[PDB]
């Protein structure tokens, strides 16, 4: 299942990870392509932050979904 990974810069990235997949794994995938570390990666979905120990099925994240990636939170 393909998924969209938006960014504040306007950069949308595609990733392949089924519902059973874990959020921690997702962050690892993004880090493989974009190089960004999971320690700084922030995944937002449905207004809630994705938990590294949870799975895409926990937040009911289906295919063709959009995940907001927050990087370097200088604001609040």
């Amino acid at each position: 299942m393909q998924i969209f990974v938006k960014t504040l810069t306007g950069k949308t990235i595609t990733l392949e990870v089924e519902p059973s997949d874990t959020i921690e794994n997702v962050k690892a995938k993004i880090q493989d392509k974009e190089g960004i570390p999971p320690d700084q990666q922030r995944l937002i979905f449905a207004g809630k932050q994705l938990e590294d120990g949870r799975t895409l099925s926990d937040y009911n994240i289906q295919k063709e979904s959009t995940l907001h990636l927050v990087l370097r939170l200088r604001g609040g």
């Binding site: 504040l8 306007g10 449905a46 207004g47 809630k48 927050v70 939170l73 200088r74 604001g75 609040g76």
Partner: protein
């Protein structure tokens, strides 16, 4: 004198320092400079926070 913005889409804060805005709302502009591109700072019902990639349009 007065610089505010209207919320065009719903946004739910994930952190305590984050702000929550619904559609048809009123966000007060605090500082278009938060140190993060695409993120502005505003004030709402006693709480202040930022929104992703501009969820508010300066109406005033």
């Amino acid at each position: 004198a007065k610089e505010y913005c209207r919320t065009l889409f719903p946004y739910t804060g994930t952190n305590e320092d984050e702000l929550t805005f619904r559609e048809g709302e009123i966000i007060h502009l605090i500082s278009k400079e938060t140190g993060e591109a695409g993120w502005w700072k505003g004030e709402l019902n006693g709480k202040e926070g930022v929104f992703p990639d501009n969820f508010a349009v300066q109406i005033s």
